[PDB]
A paper describes a structure:
The ordered assembly of tau protein into amyloid filaments defines a number of neurodegenerative diseases, also known as tauopathies; they are the most common proteinopathies of the human nervous system. The physiological function of tau is to promote the assembly, and possibly stability, of microtubules. Here, we used cryo-EM to determine the structures of heparin-induced filaments assembled from recombinant full-length 4R tau (2N4R, 441 amino acid isoform) and the corresponding 3R isoform (2N3R, 410 amino acid isoform) to resolutions sufficient for de novo atomic modelling. Our results show that heparin-induced 2N4R filaments consist of a mixture of at least four different conformations, whereas heparin-induced 2N3R filaments mainly adopt a single conformation.
Numbering used by the authors:
A (entry chain B), B (entry chain A), C (entry chain C): 274 to 292, 304 to 321
The structure:
């Protein structure tokens, strides 16, 4: 039982809670490869 | 039982709580490879 | 039971609490490889 995993998550704008601020992402460019050989 | 894992997460704008500030990401460029051989 | 893990996380803009300031990332360039052989 062999199990190979490649992961890369992209979360941009996230707020969370359990129980002013300025956040800017200006022009992101992504050339990023997910290769499995 | 063999299990190979490659991980690389990308979270840009994150706030969190459990119970002014300025954050700027200007033009990020990403050439970053996820190779599994 | 063999288990090989490669990890590299990217968190850019993070605030957190449990119970003015200026943070600038200007033009980050990332050529960084995740290889598993």
């Amino acid at each position: 039982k062999v199990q190979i995993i490649n992961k890369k998550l992209d979360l941009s704008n996230v707020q969370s809670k359990c129980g002013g601020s300025v956040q800017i992402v200006y022009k992101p460019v992504d050339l990023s490869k997910v290769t499995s050989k």
